[model samples]
Target chain A: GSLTEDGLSYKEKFVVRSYEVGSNKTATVETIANLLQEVGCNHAQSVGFSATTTTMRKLHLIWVTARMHIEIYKYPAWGDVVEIETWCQSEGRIGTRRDWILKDSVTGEVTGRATSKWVMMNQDTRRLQKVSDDVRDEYLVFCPQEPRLAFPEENNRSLKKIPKLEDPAQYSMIGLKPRRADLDMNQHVNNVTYIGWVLESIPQEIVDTHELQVITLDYRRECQQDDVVDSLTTTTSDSQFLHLLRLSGDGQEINRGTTLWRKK
Target chain B: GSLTEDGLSYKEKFVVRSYEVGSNKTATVETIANLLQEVGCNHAQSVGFSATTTTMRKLHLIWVTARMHIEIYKYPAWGDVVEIETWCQSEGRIGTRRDWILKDSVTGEVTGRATSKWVMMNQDTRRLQKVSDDVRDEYLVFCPQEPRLAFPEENNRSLKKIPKLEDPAQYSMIGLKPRRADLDMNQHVNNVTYIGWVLESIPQEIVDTHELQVITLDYRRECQQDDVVDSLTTTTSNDSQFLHLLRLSGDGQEINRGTTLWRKK
Candidate 1:
């Protein structure tokens, strides 16, 4: 579901400090997750709603979470205003869904967007069911339309293709995949998982070689729990390095980076 | 180093909520990290004196972030009031050190504690140096000598032993060492990496069984870049489960346990 033009919509604003900038004026994925969390948590609460205990319980009911998918399309530069937009919506008995759109306000471009699913349940019973009509209705006041979700429609799924990694030298032997617990409020992949992909791409030998002194990254893409990606790399002389990661299927570049490893 | 009757200090109050509790009201390691962050960030802004850009630059210089070690003597309960105490002390030419102690306020019992190292540097020259006399002088003003850091000398640096999975029927596993570019963070494993371990532990067949109706978990530990943890499992029932995790070290017992339940769809 997507945000309605009006409702308990939220817009999170922040400036990327100079110290946070990387070689390409990019921020780290960790910062992006932090921003997403800020937007999700704040937007949910700004309208007198919290991701209450019952909300978590409801997720346990369907034996699945409401989080289905996310995509990070671009990166914001230093002092850029990143605005994350969010709203809630509903579908039959499936429960309510929260949708998000993060944008580079200066460029008027979308930075990222995510679609999440949520169910309400009785915390006492530890079972799932329809949300109390009163509470559901209360939340429905903030309902949005689902932009990425298409029911029983295969063609509706949208995943963009990303550039492939060519001759990734130092990062040739790294691998990582999402475990079940990576599921977040909507049960889809949490933004944090993308950072893991970035970290896992570093070869163990390289990891053993240099010590990580400082790091700065920016979130450019988001992946679901099961979506696999290609890890791209570019190595330079003097121990300098750059890396790129993408969901191999649609070729969506979820994240890119330039990391420095210093001799101990 | 330890917090004693008279020592440098920073203290803030915190609470153990149900979400923070696991396995019989025990607080998770991630909660401990959060508390530490709260204490550090809060203390950093204390005295209404902020870390100026220059101070921040100077602090980053010698800030080695050398090593961090945590010791948990007792597991705390949810809703329990806690006082997080921290201190910064000199560590010779290597760098300055910051330490923490989490205590139960009602009984004054120590729940957990840790120590970390940071170095000061010369921003322009990129050379490491001792903390400037000026910075030290400023820090001394906020120093409270009431509680000295209590470093646990007896603590072993080994990974804790894992009980054999005696009853496959009785136990469900959680946790797995992180690999791939999937769940890592900047300087450490991403917070969700721990959760991924819990998810990966379930038998694949079972995971594919339910179409995943719902999944939820509370984050508890911050897996560092240098650490690897063993996932532990215990089953409460066919439909419910508990999972624990611990970073493997020289000693086997130093670990964090996280318990989560899942129902068949």
Candidate 2:
């Protein structure tokens, strides 16, 4: 973590634990999602922009992901070491951005990459909040003058807006509950768990014959511990799927996303 | 891993990942269980006794845990470094035992200890097998002449045997399915996943106010990737103690029995 791009980036090395691998002898998508979460949090903490910061503590604020996109070229195998580098920059007055590059520790080949946008919310009120100049300046020192995007698009735009899912979703899963272990320090169901449920909604045939190559998520609202949820997914084309996760009680949307897959 | 006890033990240092912690901001029981599994597997691989071993691989043999007991005095917080040391010894002729000691890397204070017994299984036959002399000779060099136990029972007896959970159980969760992530390289639902279901049976209220101190598991049968499970738990006369049972939802065959002790937070 000490060696960053002019103190603007953070990096850490992790050994793929045996339990993190699946039957294929390779790490699962959830494992990568977890590592991404870890590196992003560590980078924020290093820059004094985490919940522990004085400004955030006094304001009862915490960061939450609004949108994210990830692409994986290869999955690390058990006992393999991976070095992850992450950096963040201001998005606008109301949000911020973070990007990551995952490499093989020995060969230094890029295995995966990710980028995300985040917004702050009042932990007590549970509503979105604007970035204050005081908090912004605290972290701006580390922002690179020329911001970087993990995925360069044709028009410098995201993959797609991940439109709201409509009726008659091809597949659905109901009565999904959050295990006690799902909650993080924030006491909210971690964003990674939502991704798991999204995959769960996929037909078993796809789960058996294909693997996730990329994913995009738009987190619309936060979910609590006691909320029973429903997951809806519909295939858009050959190997692309759009998904929606919502509260079972009122059909309030929790997340809308899209994903791409390749046959195993 | 460079340091060990006279080449009889294997040690590794791990920083508690942020996601491994619970709402209390400390590592969970499952987190420690995974580490124990990792260390045990690494120790055998270090020697010539793992599934990758020539003899075992040719014979289609694999090791599976039969019984285990763990005691956690303190749960390391996120970012804390924990050093774990593990060693194994032969248990009679057909079984083997492994023990571990977890410490706070900075202060060198012991935080937890665990002991487990494993038996060989014919991978294709799915039946218990004895340790042949040829395989035993390979791993014997790593065993201490006088074996050590993480816990010193008065008479070398393990914890009280976990009794069967009978009908009229106070709480039970049915139709528990394993997530795809639960399976390990052996294609079996890893033993750590079973421990998670045991705690899931406890009421949420108890979970909020209590912390696990000790756990004992008796693995009666193995669980498959596509199997559906039911976890049954009953509160004992002592509110701090509980009994649990896991069974196949399709056949009602007993899979595992466990006991747990919790401390009021």
Candidate 3:
């Protein structure tokens, strides 16, 4: 929805900083992920689902991402102003869905769109819970019946599980260790940092010659401080790549995704 | 001096994010330092001293900080909007002086002020240079006649060299290695990251008990990626402290300064 609309959505403007741009001098996937997280966090707080305050009353708040599908039509350049509009709605009794629309602030042209599904986990028992009436009551007032821009349901209903790349000979891998700077208030590695790790594993030749067109990710688990992760990527075709993020110690998966790229 | 005026200064508004605030739930020193650097860079570009474009013409551009004095009467909390106004004036022919005044946007009250001195350096030669007439002409138009919030000259003219702590038993030190995140576009460790190192060396008990009132820093040399730095500090008294940053390899000083602390209100 547009910023001018009543409180159904929230909008924030950001002036793309030089540091936020990738080597290509345009907004990177990781940069957009940061912006999305900010909007989602702010949206939750506005609706009485505060991360810091709610934990005090024995009511834990968690938004576990089931999947994220992003379609980028254009990436803003450094010094360009970007407006991000985000809102949430009920996915079902057990889940909630959030959507974001990115636009060029000056032109008012749509640049990107994203949709994600989330489920809350009880903090003490560590179990996913259905939207209790009390919790859903606080959010139902703000949930829009329909998304501003509809994402094709058939294409994104469910992603095929990414099989583990068995042949080391076919793909590339990189080892990463989380640093203090990577931690967020939640005491885990920020989701966007995983995107950086995926890109880092790609061959330099490919990175220098291509631009990302779209990305689809499934975040399965949380990565904690000092956790060593191995990022693996294998080319499925000339234009697409499959990625897997795993804990180096146990081979437990942290995140998995697919990326589509175009020749520069 | 205010945002309403043109050419005299540049103003930018920032809403402090939760990540930008420190444990005190207020904007951290490093956050403000990042904002200050941005305004300075933007101000220079507005006056025809663009960092990227001008440097492409082989006219190397470099502004090295020799000293900075910042006084904070209040620190803005998370979700507070801060307005920063900055401008630069000639510091004789060889240098320039930049000043900043920070205000709480909603209340329009002064919260902080800072002044810094910078000298131009030839990028290729690595030596300081006098402001050439051509360069001076481009900057003269925007240079303000005086700072909007005048910092006392006598109180901040120069700082005494901080003495090395004789007793290793009396202080604490943390070894920090510059990471990829610490480097800026120039490929050098950012000035604000040094503040993080200094804070890391302070004992947790003291950090929780006090707030910084004033800080004066002298940046000596640029630290590069993978360089290990030793952040050393000692409590001088109940309400003051001294800190030093040096290379772990040769003990070359990277930064030295003192800070006055106040009990949390």
TM-score of each predicted structure versus truth: 0.43, 0.92, 0.81
> How many steric clashes does model 3 contain?
0
Number of the top DockQ candidate: 2
Q: Can you list each candidate's DockQ?
A: 0.12, 0.64, 0.24
B1-265: candidate 3 lDDT, tens digit per residue: 1333666888888788666666666877777878788777766656566532343346776777877777778889878899888877777776878888899999999998888878887777778877777767666677766644447565552345555544362454444655434555455677777666665566656656787777767676666665666666666664565554444535655454444455554
Candidate 3 residue-wise lDDT at A207 = 61
- Count clashing pairs, candidate 2: 0
The digit string of per-residue lDDT tens for model 1 on A1-264 reads 123356557775766533333334455545555566656665655666546535544444332233334445555775477877776666556676666677887776776665555665553464567665555665665654444332225543222232334553456323344554454434456555555566566666665565443232334544665666666566654254566777667667666555556664
Which candidate number has the best lDDT? 2
lDDT tens string, model 2, B1-265? Answer: 5337488889988888888899788999999999888877677667655533588888888777898888999999998999999888887666888889999999999999999888988888888988888878877778886858898775543557677888988999887777666677756788988898888899877778988888888999877766788899998842388899999988899999998888889
Per-residue lDDT over B131-240 for candidate 1, one digit per residue giving the tens place of the 0 to 100 score: 56666665555554343455645543311232333334233332245553322223445443454455455565554443221222332334555555555455544455
Ranked by lDDT, the better of candidates 2 and 3 is 2
Q: Which tens-of-lDDT digit does each residue in A1-264 have in candidate 2?
A: 443857878899888888888667788888899999888778767765653358788888877789888888888988899999988888767788888999999999999999888898887788997888887877777777685777767554355777887898999988777766677875778889888888878887886688788898899887787787899999999399999999989999999989898999
| Candidate 3 docking class | acceptable
